[PDB]
Amino acid sequence: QPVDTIIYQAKVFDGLGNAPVHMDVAIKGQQIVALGELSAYQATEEVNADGLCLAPGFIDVHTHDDLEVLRNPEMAAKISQGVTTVITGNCGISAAPAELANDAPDPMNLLGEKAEFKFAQLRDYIDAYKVQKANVNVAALVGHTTLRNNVMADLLRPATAAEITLMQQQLDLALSQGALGLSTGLAYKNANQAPSSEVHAFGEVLKKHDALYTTHLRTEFDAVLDAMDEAFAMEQAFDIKVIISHLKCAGKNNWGRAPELLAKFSEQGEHSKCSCDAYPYAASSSTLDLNQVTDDFDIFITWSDSHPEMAEQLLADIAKQWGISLLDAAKQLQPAGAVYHGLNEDDVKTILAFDKTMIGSDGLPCDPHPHPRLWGSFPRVLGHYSREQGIFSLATAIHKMTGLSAANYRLANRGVIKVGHFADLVLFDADEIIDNATFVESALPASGIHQVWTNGQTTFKDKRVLPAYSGQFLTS
């Protein structure tokens, strides 16, 4: 009857949005084994959490960490924020099941270089993960654009009916091997010509596996509401769980339209289970897209293969030095990465406050000067938006990165501090927790996190990332 660890006298948040409770938490093996008051229990290790808070480990529902978790199993960018589980395979791109011919078509470079895609089937990817495991648990979506690339040489078109049949069987096999569902990125060049009927062709497979559908909307600018109708039609037709990724209304035309996005959820019809996620910043980030170049707001170049000397500079400054328009400068900078300061802060606050919204970092792990969301998202929610701005309580903030997310993705026995659940846990100081990553110094680690456990083993303690490698692959 001894346990490995008891955490004494933390302010414990259960992850369900309830008021915190002062009590002790016992860990043995991978599991939370006792809650309440455990001075009469025998523990090898005793942690004094007086004055601190304990919460379930944070679940990053929107990552591009597919290959990063193999390259970098310590996962400092996420672990130092309190993240214990990552959801991979978003916006239509995944590491598996993928077989590459010529190149990795865009946006697969967000994941890694062509040579890294060594996983013809999902089980190859799970095998690779299990060589070292990682400091985070992994749950994987299958990317629709990745599936298209397996069967299409020319991506600038709808898939044929026969190519769709192949993709249906590839998704079915991947789901049987453990994938959670399918993601799309319908705004990207290499998926934009997929009609809604092509996406609908996956619905029966998803429904048969009780699997998920996540989507980067076909547009997030003027016609964003039309794009949301597309996502709801998947829920209407198949009664499956749908999640809209990084909800936003982008572009100067659309600042102030966040209430329209919220109200659009009233058009779901029969089922009302569509969810969404967001990152806590008023700026987006992706490979430089000529269609988004504007003088309406700041655009910052993060990398450029053509002109690396212009990295970490404002597009308007680059254009002035070069003596040409912003659009012509962008043409010469490609291929390049950018941070677009194209969102409105009041819109962001409304979308974060929305009770359907989970927290997702959308961190880009191959970016050499990344958007700071890669390193600051979850402490920014707890410290900036909860404590400082007062948009919501700490209990609400925690719920939106733990229990809400485990429920929506059906992650068994995670996201909640309850006896019998896994001991993914974060110990932190509520008054000091804060993001330090800025747009200029975008990899500064957060403050206020004292200790992190993944499946009962310490992966972070007193500013040290620790290679416990106790994460697991979470199969459906």
Q: Which residues contact 440 (CB under 8 A, 6 or more apart)?
A: none
Please identify, using beta-carbon distances, which residue of 216 and 450 lies nearer to Zn ion.
Answer: 216
User: Is 31 or 219 the residue whose CB approaches Zn ion more closely?
Assistant: 219
Kindly state the smallest distance separating residue 246's Cβ from Zn ion, in Å.
Answer: 6
Q: Least distance from C-beta 268 to Zn ion, angstroms?
A: 22
| C-alpha to C-alpha distances, 166 to 150, 169, 198, 338, nearest whole angstrom | 9, 5, 12, 35
Fill in the amino acid letter for 381.
V
Cβ proximity to Zn ion: between 91 and 139 the closer is 91
Q: Which of residues 246-305 bind Zn ion (CB under 5 A)?
A: none
User: Of 216 and 369, which CB lies nearer to Zn ion in the complex structure?
Assistant: 216
Q: Which is nearer to Zn ion, 11 or 216 (CB)?
A: 216
Binding of Zn ion by 91 (CB under 5 A)? yes
Interaction pattern, residues 159-198, with Zn ion; x per rule: CB under 5 A? ----------------------------------------
**Shortest Cβ distance from residue 187 to Zn ion (Å)?**
7
Please tell me the distance from the alpha carbon of residue 153 to that of residue 138, in angstroms, as a whole number. Answer: 30
Pair of tokens at residue 25: 């938490």
Instruction: Give least dist CB 148 to Zn ion, A.
Output: 16
DSSP β-ladder status, 457-461 and 449-454: antiparallel
Which of the stretches 20-28, 208-216, 313-321, 454-462 binds Zn ion when contact is defined by CB under 5 A? 208-216
Q: Does 343 bind Zn ion (CB under 5 A)?
A: no
Q: Which residues fall within 8 angstroms of residue 390, CB to CB, at 6 or more apart?
A: none
Q: Please choose, out of 62-70, 211-219, 295-303, 365-373, the segment that lies near Zn ion by the rule CB under 5 A.
A: 211-219
C-beta of 57 vs 92, nearer to Zn ion? 92
Least distance in Å: CB of 371 to Zn ion? Answer: 12
In whole angstroms, the minimum distance from the beta carbon of 196 to Zn ion comes to 18
Q: Which is nearer to Zn ion, 80 or 183 (CB)?
A: 183
The span of 87-95, 230-238, 296-304, 459-467 binding Zn ion (CB under 5 A) equals 87-95
Q: Which residues contact residue 314 at a Cβ distance below 8 angstroms, ignoring those fewer than 6 apart?
A: 298, 299, 300, 301
The distance of closest approach from Cβ of residue 108 to Zn ion in the complex, given in angstroms and rounded to an integer, is: 13
At 144, list the tokens: 């629709």
Residue with Cβ nearer Zn ion (286 or 472): 286
CB atoms within 10 A of CB 419: 12
Q: Cα–Cα distance between 195 and 193 in angstroms, integer?
A: 6
The residues with which 185 forms a beta bridge, in sequence order, are 216
User: Of 86 and 416, which has the nearer Cβ to Zn ion?
Assistant: 86
Please report how close the Cβ of residue 50 comes to Zn ion at its closest, in angstroms: 42
Whole-number minimum distance, CB 89 to Zn ion, in Å?
A: 12
Give me the least distance between CB of 51 and Zn ion, in Å please.
39
- Taking the least distance from each CB to Zn ion, the nearer of 184 and 268 is 184
**Do 111 and 64 meet the contact criterion of CB atoms below 8 Å apart?**
yes
Q: Point out which span in 214-222, 263-271, 375-383, 406-414 binds Zn ion (CB under 5 A).
A: 214-222
The answer to whether 54 and 426 have CB atoms below 8 angstroms apart is: yes
Using CB under 5 A, which of 11, 216, 241, 371 touches Zn ion?
216
Query: Binding segment for Zn ion among 158-166, 213-221, 313-321, 444-452 (CB under 5 A)?
Result: 213-221
Q: Which residue has the tokens 């909307």?
A: 217
- Residue with smaller CB distance to Zn ion, 17 or 365: 365
Considering only the stretches 90-98, 158-166, 377-385, 459-467, report the one whose residues sit in contact with Zn ion under the rule CB under 5 A. Answer: 90-98
Give how many residues touch Zn ion by CB under 5 A.
2
Q: Which stretch binds Zn ion (CB under 5 A): 210-218, 293-301, 383-391, 456-464?
A: 210-218
Measured from the CB of residue 11, what is the shortest distance to Zn ion in angstroms?
Answer: 36
Q: Which residue ranges make up the site for Zn ion (CB under 5 A)?
A: 91, 216
